[PDB]
């Protein structure tokens, strides 16, 4: 029933409004196509929005904290892998303001 909210959180994230800085997170990070020789060495557990939406559909999340853990690991991963002055970092924080806000104003 809280997952009725995470569904609305996920749609908000995936909406056109945010498309300018959400696109790095639509699909799993493609290490081979971008030449990130070191990526899967640094990031043990990759995550993206497509993958969140799939786990949401196979109902692989029991409650809201499990969903939020995947959403945050997604951001944590960009932070870990990328230097502080890269564009992808800033996109990550913009998207994360949207998530942390909408996630905090969850009824319960």
């Amino acid at each position: 029933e809280q997952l009725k909210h995470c569904n609305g959180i996920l749609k908000e994230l995936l909406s056109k409004k945010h498309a300018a800085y959400a696109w790095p997170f639509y699909k799993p990070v493609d290490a081979s196509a971008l030449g990130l020789h070191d990526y899967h060495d640094i990031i043990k557990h990759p995550m993206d929005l497509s993958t969140v939406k799939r786990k949401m559909e196979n109902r692989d999340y029991r409650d809201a904290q499990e969903f939020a853990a995947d959403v945050r690991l997604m951001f944590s991963n960009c932070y870990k892998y990328n230097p502080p002055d890269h564009d992808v970092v800033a996109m990550a924080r913009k998207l994360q303001d949207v998530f942390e806000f909408r996630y905090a104003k969850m009824p319960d």
Binding site: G35, H37, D38, N82, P83, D85, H86, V88, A90, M91
Partner: peptide, 15 residues
Amino acid sequence: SGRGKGGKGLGKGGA
């Protein structure tokens, strides 16, 4: 290789 995706100093904003 190194460290990012190639967007060092790209984009707009961030102080």
